[PDB]
Structures are given as structure tokens and as C-alpha cells.
Design a protein around this ligand. Sequence first.
Ligand SMILES: [Mg+2]
Ligand SMILES: [Mg+2]
Length: 76
Amino acid sequence: LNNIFEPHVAVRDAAKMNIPTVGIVDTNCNPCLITYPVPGNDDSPLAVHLYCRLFQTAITRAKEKRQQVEALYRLQ
RNA sequence: AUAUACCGCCAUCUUAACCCUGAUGAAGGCUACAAAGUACGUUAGGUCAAGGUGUAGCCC
Ligand SMILES: [Mg+2]
Ligand SMILES: [Mg+2]
């Protein structure tokens, strides 16, 4: 949601550009066009910190796994 | 006599695209503590005095 409590324009624009979206949706949000919605609280700092931690950890772990797999492929 | 013959000189006037919204109707698009907006000719002109090339007139 933007600051007028309407959807972020990027949701519709990403749908137009065929870019998948992950999103945190609160009870007053519209999840119809988010590809992978995650229902949850987006206001409490604890919750937002948990989301940031999870996504950062997943991204770094995936990138490290890619590096390890390519290294194994070349070495072996 | 004619630049109301040209040339010279002066002067007069004339000389987009993309992206969104509305049911992809006519149509519309701003808020900063930010909400779709971003990129030459012309003249019955003057000048025959610091300049020219022609054309015509009269020639009891
Ligand atoms: Mg909320
Ligand atoms: Mg004249």
C-alpha cells in the first residue's frame, strides 16, 4: 500500500510487465495480483524485521549454494 | 525619358515521441510526510551626386 492506503502502482505495473511479485499483505490489502502473497502484519517493526531477515537469509543462502554448485561442477 | 529597364545601395512587409487512466467512448494525466507521468521572397518604393549594362525618344 502507498501512503494514501491504495495499492502501490508497482503491483499493477509488474503484472503488466509479467514480473512475478512476492508481497506481504495485511487484512486491508488486496492480494489478487500478487503472485506469492504472504498474509501477515506489515506495521509492527518486529514483523518487518523478521521478514527482512528471512528474505536476506534466503537470498544469500541461494547465491552461496549457486557458487558451491558451480565450483563442484568445475572441479569434478 | 526609363532603376514604372536591369545590377549596386537604402528602405517596406511576409516567412514530437513514449507510458498510464476512463470497460482501450467523446476524453484525461496533479498532491514533495508526493497518489502516472517522463522525455528567401515582396514593392506601379527611393536613389543616375561620389557606381555601372541596356533600352527607347526628337533629328525643318
Ligand atoms: Mg498494515
Ligand atoms: Mg521605382
